[PDB]
Amino acid sequence: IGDEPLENYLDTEYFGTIGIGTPAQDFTVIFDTGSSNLWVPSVYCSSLACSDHNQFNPDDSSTFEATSQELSITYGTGSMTGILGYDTVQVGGISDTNQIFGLSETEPGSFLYYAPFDGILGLAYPSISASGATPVFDNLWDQGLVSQDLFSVYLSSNDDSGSVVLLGGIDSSYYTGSLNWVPVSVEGYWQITLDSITMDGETIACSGGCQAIVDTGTSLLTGPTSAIANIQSDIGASENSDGEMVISCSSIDSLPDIVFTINGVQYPLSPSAYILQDDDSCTSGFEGMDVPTSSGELWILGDVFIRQYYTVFDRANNKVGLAPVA
Numbered sequence: 001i002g003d004e005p006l007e008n009y010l011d012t013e014y015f016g017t018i019g020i021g022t023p024a025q026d027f028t029v030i031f032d033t034g035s036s037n038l039w040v041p042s043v044y045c046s047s048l049a050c051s052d053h054n055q056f057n058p059d060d061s062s063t064f065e066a067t068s069q070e071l072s073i074t075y076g077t078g079s080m081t082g083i084l085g086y087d088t089v090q091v092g093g094i095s096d097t098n099q100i101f102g103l104s105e106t107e108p109g110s111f112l113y114y115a116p117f118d119g120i121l122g123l124a125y126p127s128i129s130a131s132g133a134t135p136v137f138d139n140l141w142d143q144g145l146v147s148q149d150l151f152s153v154y155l156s157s158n159d160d161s162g163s164v165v166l167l168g169g170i171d172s173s174y175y176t177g178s179l180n181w182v183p184v185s186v187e188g189y190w191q192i193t194l195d196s197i198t199m200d201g202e203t204i205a206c207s208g209g210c211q212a213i214v215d216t217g218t219s220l221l222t223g224p225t226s227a228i229a230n231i232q233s234d235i236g237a238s239e240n241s242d243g244e245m246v247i248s249c250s251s252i253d254s255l256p257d258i259v260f261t262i263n264g265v266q267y268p269l270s271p272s273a274y275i276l277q278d279d280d281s282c283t284s285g286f287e288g289m290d291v292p293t294s295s296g297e298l299w300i301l302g303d304v305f306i307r308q309y310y311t312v313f314d315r316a317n318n319k320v321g322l323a324p325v326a
């Protein structure tokens, strides 16, 4: 069982350190359950974002193996192109030998330039991995480096330390009650069916159900634009002249919970969860973002949600487990 500590950066980004190569070259990466590739910047990249982050240098590792397979990934925000290579990846105390990963060659645009972290470590299914690159957790399982085919995630609140990804285990001290298991509706993302979103026992979005993903790599709780506007209206949020969904810090205390029903079970978020506070600057924890799929538009249950619920991602089962944080 491997234990990867995560830094909680401003309750907005959670990343941990990994080593790549021999000897290990270190990188910070988002542990991202909404994607499946591992990549880091490399010395082959001249983009601005590569210039202000740690760069992998294959010529300094005795265990690197080149490939000629190319890689291209577009995220919600940010994108990269690169080349795949193999090396040993030290993650959560495990030596992940023979791990295929991306060496960036372009990282265009500005979001990544300002980001504290170097790269991304995807924890989703191989079906959404670009160039069909074996994801890290799949490689760990395939090599028998974890005995149970599952991992769990605790994300801390209030910028505290203690966030972790537990590779190959579940630690019950992080949660109250027993885990509620939710079947994966579509295997690619960790995608599940949301049954309803309610406030004061009135349904306010996702009438008749809707698809959602559990995504540690997304800060906010996102959903279709029109539905989110309604929610924002419902919690009394309004965009300021600077493009920021502002809310009076007094509402944290007046407002009711917003309840997510998942596999027939209620998962409330109190105002203190769905409203972000920073010394009398309070923004909405909801953000409108349209994510079209075959099935339907996706909701994203990001860090706003995950901070409240210890999450188990079970590949043996194809289930997500949830329970309220301790």
Ligand SMILES: CC(C)(C)NC(=O)[C@@H]1C[C@@H]2CCCC[C@@H]2CN1C[C@@H](O)[C@H](Cc1ccccc1)NC(=O)[C@H](CC(N)=O)NC(=O)c1ccc2ccccc2n1
Pocket (backbone or CB within 6 Å): 030, 032, 033, 034, 035, 036, 073, 074, 075, 076, 077, 078, 079, 111, 120, 128, 129, 130, 215, 217, 218, 219, 222, 289, 291, 300
């Ligand atoms: C959703 C949003 C608020 C924009 N947040 C993010 O995107 C953060 C931003 C972070 C900083 C920069 C680098 C990426 C990380 C991780 N991501 C979360 C990350 O978990 C994100 C969640 C997501 C899923 C689907 C659609 C959009 C967004 N996943 C992704 O972005 C995955 C990555 C992949 N190729 O597998 N991308 C897609 O699934 C993707 C992107 C663009 C598309 C355009 C047309 C058709 C299909 C498309 N699919």
